[PDB]
C-alpha cells in the first residue's frame, strides 16, 4: 500500500548493480527515545572494516529522536555489533550502536550498557537465550495486510503454519527477511505463520549473553527495512487487534551451563522458584510501558497467562513459564518465559532474568554493583 | 487476485539471491486435523542433511491445527520424506512429516503410520501406484480463475488439453509447478489442461508402496506454495462447480509384480473381483468425509461411475474400474481405479487397495495385525 | 487483455530457471475434431530422445476433443515430427502427432496419413512448398488487438509493413514467435505487418513434401502458445472483420525439380492448366468448411480472386494463381496459389496440389491407390 | 451492484409520469415449479377492474418455468387475489394467480387449491395467522449486501434493530417495500433490522385463513421487485451464511376464535399437544425440500430449536413453539410456531397447522375429503 | 453503456419543462433502404394537427439512407399514421410515413403501399392481427445488456417472466416503452421477460388490416428511442447469440370475422391447409433477407419449427402453426403463425397471410390486380 512501494523498483536495481569501488557504506542503527523505534544513517568509509572495533564513533541530534532538551541535544553513537548489510551487499555493513548523551552517560533507553555488565558478571555459567519474535503485517492504513477492507477474514484456525493464497498473507516479507538475516549473520533459528492471519514469527537463537539483545534488535531493524521495501508496516504491538484475535508475544528461552548438562532440571526448577517471587518486577521489565501494553495481551484466554498471576508447568501453554515436555523427559535443557510482550526490549528481558535467577536479587529495584 | 500477489516480486528476488552461507533451511510439512489441509514451518540447520534420517524431530501446537483439546495440545513431527526445496533452492529442504500426539500415538489424520505397515507386509509383490491429481484454479473470491466475473465461459469442449488465451486459464501455475516438482525430486509423470476451463491435472508415478502417498502429498504442497505466489487458490474439491461442469477426481493406477509380468491380466481380473465385493468400504476410504464429498461427483453422467454401483470394463470411461485398452491387448500391466475423489488421502486409497486385493480382507473394518 | 496475462511473469521466470535434472518434458501436440484447433499435453521422459522414433505412442479422450462418441472414445497419438521446445528450452521437446481411433484407423481430421502416402508417390520429383500464413491479433473480447474500443483505426494504407506506435500493433508477439520458431527448428522464412492493423504474416518454407504441413502446423501451435503468454488471441479466420478490411489468406508456393531447373516455366504452365480444370475441387480442400469460410474472403475486391472463377497471370495480384514476375523473366521457379484460406489444413492443400498437378487426377473425388 | 441498477433512473421516471389514458396494466404473478420462485407478466385491460372476479384467465409456457414436459406444456393462470400496483400506481393492478395444467388439474406447486378447501372447512372458527418473514440482502456476487469484500463485518450484537451507517445495511429497500405494501393493500404489521447485518424482517398479519398465504406471497413478490430496482437480491434461504451467523426463519402466529376469547389458553395448549405428536410431518411441510433446507438452520444453537426434537414453553426463544409471556399472563391469545423456514410456502404451513390442530388428523399423509 | 446516456439527464429535463408555446413539433418516421432500420426528423408546425390528413408531405435525401443513386436522390414522405409523441408530450406528434421516389413511385422497401391495397380488397372479412415482438437488449459493445463481461450468465430456466436483480435484466426499458406506447396510442397488449436473459417481448394487437404494420413499426421506433435514452441497443435479430440460447421471433396471430364467429375453426383449418402448400413463399416473406436470417433461428430445437418443413398442431409449441388449445376447445378464434423472424416487416407478413389464405393465390410470385 505505501507510495514509495509503487516506485519502479527495477530502476533502483539498475543503480544498485553499479560496481561500487573501494569506498564502503556503513549504516549505523540505534534505539529511539521511545525504547521501541529504531533509527539509522549512513557514512562512507575508506575501506572495509575488519571488525566492529575499527568503526568510528558518531553522533546525531537527540532532540529529533525524543531523546533530549534544547541546548545540549547532541548525542553519541558507539559501535557495538557489526553485520553484513543485506540491503547493500558486501563490503557494506550494518552497525548496531549504543547511545550516550553529551556528558558521555548512557541514554535513558540505552539498556545495553547495564545489561552488558550483568552478563559479564555471569559469563562462566554461559547463559544462553532464544527469543520467539511475533509481529503483524499492516497496510499503511493501519489495517492488517491482506485483510478485507474494513473487515475481518474468517475465524482463526486455518492460518497457523498455513499454506495457500487464502491462508498465508505476506510470506514474501518473511522469506526475504529470513535470507536477509542469514546473509547479515543474524542467528535466525526459524519461522512460522502465526494464528492470526497476517501475523508471523521468527525465532532468534541460541545466543550467549549480550548477543541475544544485539541479534534480536538487528533482526527487527532488518524486518523494518524489508517491510519498507514492500510498502507494509511491521507492528510489534502485543495486541494489534482487540478481541478474538491472537496477541503477539516474545517468548524467551533460557538456560545456563548447569541447566543444559545432566539433571539440570533441578536448577531449572530452582530459578523458576526465584521467578515466582518476582512476577511483579518482571512484568515491569517485559514491555516499555512498564506493563501497560502487555495488559491487553495477558488475559488468561487465547493461551496466555493472566498478567496478575504467576504460574508454571510442564508443557503448559497457558502458564507464565513453560518447561518443554521433552525437557521434563530428559531432566535437562531450558525453560520458556512466555510473559514478554512482542515489543519488549530484549536487553531489559535478559537482564531481569539474570538478576533474579542467577544473582538472586529481590526487592523492587535492581541492585547496583562494581 | 490475492493482495500478497500484488506485492513487488522483484524485491523478494533481490533478497532471494543473497548467498546464504553455511546455514540451511528446512521446511517441515504436515497434514491438518482436517485430513485435507497442509501446514508448515521452517527451522535453521547447521549444515545440509545428507538424508531424511539426519533431521531432528519437532513439535507444534495441535490446538491451532484442529488436532487437540486444551491441556495436552502439543504434538510431534517425525521426518518421513525429504526433498530439495524449489522455493529456496539447494541446499534447502522440504521435510514431509508424520504427526503424533503427546503420548506418542499417531494422530487421527496420520494415516501414513498404518499404511506404512501394510505396505511392508507386501513388499515382495512390489506394488506400484500412479495417481492422476485433478484440481481447479480459483481466485480469492472463490470463482474459478479467469472465468468471467459472476459468469460462465462458453460450454465445455475446447478446453481439454487446450492451447491459446481463450482456452487454457492459468498455465503459468502448471508450468512452474511441474519444474518445482522435477527439481524437488517428485515423481511427476506429466500434466494436461482438463475439460473444465481453469481445471488441470498432474500425474504422479509410478511409485512403490508408501512412496505414492509421500509424493502426492508433497506435490500438493508444492502446488499450494506455487499458487500462493501467483495469488490464486488450488481446490481439490471433487465438484467445485455444480451442474454441467466436470468434477475433479484422483484416478489411481495399480499393479503388482505379478500383474506386470506376462499374463498378469489374470491377477488384474482377480483383484477386480475382490474389489467388486467391497465397493462400499472403498467409497468410505476414497474421501475424507467418508463418501459425502464424492457423492457430488459420482453421478453417472459426465463420464463418471455412479457412487452406488460397482462396474468394470476394458477401456470403459464410465466404469468404477477401467482396464486400459492396451493392457487388455497385451494381457499384462495395471488397472485404473476411477473412484477416488480429487481430495482423498492417497495413504487411505493405497492402503484400501492393498487390503482388499492382496491381503484378501472382507468385512466392514480393517483387520488388525502384528 | 487475458486474466492469466496479468499474473506476475517474473514469478514464472524464477521457477523456470531452476536446473531441471536428468528428466525431460515432452509436449505432444495434435489436431482437433474441428480440423482447426490444436491440443496438447505433457509427459516426463527419462532422458532426451535423440529423434522422433524414440518417442512412445500415447492416447487421450477423443470425446473431450470433438472426436468420438460414448463407449469407444479413447484415441491414439503417434509421434510424427519432433522439435526443440522454445517454451521450456533444451532438453525439452515438442512432438507433433497423428491421431488414430481405437481401431487404429486414422481420425476424420488426420489428413496427414493420406497426404504422407501421396507425397511418397512423387518423391523423385522433389515437390517443394512455401506458405504465407496470415493472422490477426485479437483481444479476449474478440476485437482486434490495439484497435479503438468499439471502433476502427484510421483507414488501411499506413499499416502494411509499418513501423511506429500508431502503425504496428503487437509486434512483440511477432518477434517472439519468430525466435521461438528459429530455436524450435521451424523453417520460418520471414514475416511482415499486413495491410489491416493488428494483422501479420509469417512465411514457412521451402519445405519438402510432408514437411510443409508439419512445419506450418507446429508454427501455428507456437503462435498460439506465444499469444497465450501475452494474453491475446491469434485468429486464422479468413475474414475477421467484415467490409473494407483485408481478409487473411494462406498463399501457397509450389515447385517440382522439373519446374525449378531451366525452362521449368513450361511445366508450371502445364500444372496451372490442370488446375484450371479443377477449381471447384480445390476450393473444397482449401478450408475446413468446404469453402464456406473462404466465401467471405474471395470476393474479387481487395486484391483477391472471386471464389467462383479460376484465373492466372504473371504478377497478377487479383488472380487465383500468380506467376511471380521474375519467375516469368527467367522461365523457371515456382507459382503461387493465392486461393487457400488462412485457416486451411496445409496437409489438405498440399495433397490437392500433388493430386491435380502431378498424378493428373480429375473427377470430384480423390482416387484411391496402393 | 446489478448492471440495470446503474441505468439512469430519472429517465424511467420521466416516462413513468406520462398520463396513461383509459387503458390499464395488469401484472399476473405466480409460483414457479420450484415452489420458491415467482414469475410474472403484464397484459393491457380496457378499464380498471373493480375486483378480482373481473379479471380474465390467462396462460403461459410451463416448460419455461420448470413445470412441464414437451407436448402439453401450456398452463393456466386463474386470478385469486388482486392488489394495487405500487410500481405503476393506480389504476394498475397486481394479480396473484393459481396455476393449473392443460387438463385443468392443479400444478404440483399449486398448494393454494387444497389449502383454500381446508380453510373453508374451518371458517366458523375464524383462524388467524401472522408471519414473520426474515430475509437477507445480497449483492449480485452472492455476498451479503454491504459486507466487506470477501470478508466479514464485526460480530453479531450491534445489528438487531440497529441505526447508523455502520449498523443497518440497506434500509432503503425496507422503507420502500414497506410503503409499497401499504399502497398495495398488503397487511404489513411491521419490520425490523435482524441480528445478522444486511438481514431484515417484515411481519404480515393478522390474516384470516387463505389470506395469509396470498398476502405473504405478494409481499415477497413486492420485495423482489423493489430489490430489483435497487440492484440487490433478497434471499429467503434459511441459512445464507454458514457458522456464527443468524439463520432466517418464518415464525408463524396462530389463533382461532376459541383461543382469542377468554381462557383460550386451554385450547392453545390442546393444539400444542396435537402438534407434539406430529413434529416429523410438520418439518416436511415447513420448507420446499421436505426439511433439507431447514436442517441447516435448526441446530439448537443461536436461539433455534433442534430439527429433531419437539419442545414448547412460555416465552421460550429456544423452543419449537413459544407461548408469548403475555399470552400466558392473560390466559388468551395465540401461539408462535418457530419452526418454519424463511423459504417455506405459507399455504403449506397454514394448511398443516389447520390439519393437525383443528381437524385432528394423524398419520403420515394428509387425509382427503369432500 | 453509451456515452450519451452518461450526459446529465436532469439538464435535459429542465429544458423539457419549459412551456412550449403555440408551435408544435412533428417527428416524421420512416423505413430505411435496409427494410429494417428506421429514420426520422422533426419540423415545426403552426398548430396542433387534428388528424394525419392535415400533415404536409416532406422529403429527404435517399442516398444518405441506402435508398438511391447519385442524380435523382431526393425522396418523398407521405404521412400515413399519426400518434402522440411520448418523448415530447402533447401537443407534439409522431408521424409514420410511406416512402416514394422522385418519380412518385413507391420505394423498394415501401411494402405498405401494396399491402394497403390487398387489405382493402378483403375489408368485409375484417382481418385481425396480433404480433408478439421479441427483442434483446445489448450494450454498445454488442454483448447482451447485463451479461457478464465476455461471458455467460447461468443457463436458461430462471429468466422467462422472471423477477429480481439476478433474473430480469433491463426492465426499466420495458416499463418505459410500455407507457410510451400507451400514451402514444399504440395498441400494446402486454409484455414479458423472455427465456434468454436480457430478452423481452411485447405484444401488439389486435389490429385491423393495415393497422397492424403501422402499430408494430411505430412500437419498434418507440423502443429504439427509449433504448437510446437509456444507452442500450434493441436488436431484432432472430438469433443474437449462437447456440443454446433462445432465438427471437415475431409470432403472428390471425383471424377473420368468419374464424371468430361460431364454428370458425373450420375456416382456420381451411387457411392452414392453403398455408401448408405455400411454406417456401412465406419463409421468403418472413425476414428481409428472404429467409437467410431466419435460417439461424428455425432449427427444430429450442421450441422452433424447422425452416424446411411445414407443420401444424393444436397447442404445438414446436410447429410452424399453432392452434391455441382453447381455440380448439371452443371451435372458434384465431391461429398463430410461429414462423416470422423478430426482424420481419409486418407489412410483408400480413400481406402474405391475406394473399394465401383469403385470395387463394398460389405460384411463386404475388398476383397483380386492379
Ligand atoms: Cl542512510
Ligand atoms: Cl515458514
Ligand atoms: Cl501440458
Ligand atoms: Cl412484465
Ligand atoms: Cl429530429
Ligand atoms: Mg509462537
Ligand atoms: Mg483426467
Ligand atoms: Mg501477404
Ligand atoms: Mg425475528
Ligand atoms: Mg414469446
UniProtKB/Swiss-Prot annotation, chains A, B, C, D, E:
<feature type="binding site">
    <location>
        <begin position="334"/>
        <end position="336"/>
    </location>
    <ligand>
        <name>ADP</name>
    </ligand>
</feature>
<keyword id="KW-0460">Magnesium</keyword>
<dbReference type="InterPro" id="IPR008146">
    <property type="entry name" value="Gln_synth_cat_dom"/>
</dbReference>
<dbReference type="InterPro" id="IPR008147">
    <property type="entry name" value="Gln_synt_N"/>
</dbReference>
<keyword id="KW-0464">Manganese</keyword>
<keyword id="KW-0832">Ubl conjugation</keyword>
<feature type="binding site">
    <location>
        <position position="194"/>
    </location>
    <ligand>
        <name>Mn(2+) 2</name>
    </ligand>
</feature>
<dbReference type="GO" id="GO:1903670">
    <property type="term" value="P:regulation of sprouting angiogenesis"/>
</dbReference>
<feature type="binding site">
    <location>
        <begin position="244"/>
        <end position="245"/>
    </location>
    <ligand>
        <name>L-glutamate</name>
    </ligand>
</feature>
<dbReference type="GO" id="GO:0019706">
    <property type="term" value="F:protein-cysteine S-palmitoyltransferase activity"/>
</dbReference>
<dbReference type="GO" id="GO:0018345">
    <property type="term" value="P:protein palmitoylation"/>
</dbReference>
<dbReference type="InterPro" id="IPR027302">
    <property type="entry name" value="Gln_synth_N_conserv_site"/>
</dbReference>
<keyword id="KW-0597">Phosphoprotein</keyword>
<keyword id="KW-0007">Acetylation</keyword>
<dbReference type="GO" id="GO:0005739">
    <property type="term" value="C:mitochondrion"/>
</dbReference>
<dbReference type="GO" id="GO:0005829">
    <property type="term" value="C:cytosol"/>
</dbReference>
<keyword id="KW-0256">Endoplasmic reticulum</keyword>
<feature type="binding site">
    <location>
        <position position="322"/>
    </location>
    <ligand>
        <name>ATP</name>
    </ligand>
</feature>
<feature type="modified residue" description="N6-acetyllysine">
    <location>
        <position position="12"/>
    </location>
</feature>
<feature type="binding site">
    <location>
        <position position="132"/>
    </location>
    <ligand>
        <name>Mn(2+) 1</name>
    </ligand>
</feature>
<keyword id="KW-0496">Mitochondrion</keyword>
<comment type="subunit">
    <text>Decamer; composed of two pentamers. Interacts with PALMD. Interacts with RHOJ. Interacts with BEST2; this interaction tethers a fraction of GLUL to the membrane, causing a decrease of cytosolic glutamine synthase (GS) activity and inhibits the chloride channel activity of BEST2 by affecting the gating at the aperture in the absence of intracellular glutamate.</text>
</comment>
<feature type="binding site">
    <location>
        <position position="317"/>
    </location>
    <ligand>
        <name>ATP</name>
    </ligand>
</feature>
<feature type="binding site">
    <location>
        <position position="338"/>
    </location>
    <ligand>
        <name>L-glutamate</name>
    </ligand>
</feature>
<dbReference type="GO" id="GO:0006542">
    <property type="term" value="P:glutamine biosynthetic process"/>
</dbReference>
<keyword id="KW-0037">Angiogenesis</keyword>
<feature type="modified residue" description="Phosphoserine">
    <location>
        <position position="341"/>
    </location>
</feature>
<feature type="binding site">
    <location>
        <position position="134"/>
    </location>
    <ligand>
        <name>Mn(2+) 2</name>
    </ligand>
</feature>
<dbReference type="GO" id="GO:0005737">
    <property type="term" value="C:cytoplasm"/>
</dbReference>
<dbReference type="InterPro" id="IPR027303">
    <property type="entry name" value="Gln_synth_gly_rich_site"/>
</dbReference>
<keyword id="KW-0564">Palmitate</keyword>
<dbReference type="GO" id="GO:0005524">
    <property type="term" value="F:ATP binding"/>
</dbReference>
<keyword id="KW-0067">ATP-binding</keyword>
<feature type="modified residue" description="Phosphotyrosine">
    <location>
        <position position="102"/>
    </location>
</feature>
<dbReference type="InterPro" id="IPR036651">
    <property type="entry name" value="Gln_synt_N_sf"/>
</dbReference>
<dbReference type="GO" id="GO:0001525">
    <property type="term" value="P:angiogenesis"/>
</dbReference>
<dbReference type="GO" id="GO:0005886">
    <property type="term" value="C:plasma membrane"/>
</dbReference>
<dbReference type="InterPro" id="IPR050292">
    <property type="entry name" value="Glutamine_Synthetase"/>
</dbReference>
<feature type="binding site">
    <location>
        <position position="336"/>
    </location>
    <ligand>
        <name>Mn(2+) 1</name>
    </ligand>
</feature>
<comment type="similarity">
    <text>Belongs to the glutamine synthetase family.</text>
</comment>
<feature type="region of interest" description="Required for glutamine-induced ubiquitination by CRL4(CRBN) and proteasomal degradation">
    <location>
        <begin position="1"/>
        <end position="23"/>
    </location>
</feature>
<dbReference type="GO" id="GO:0005783">
    <property type="term" value="C:endoplasmic reticulum"/>
</dbReference>
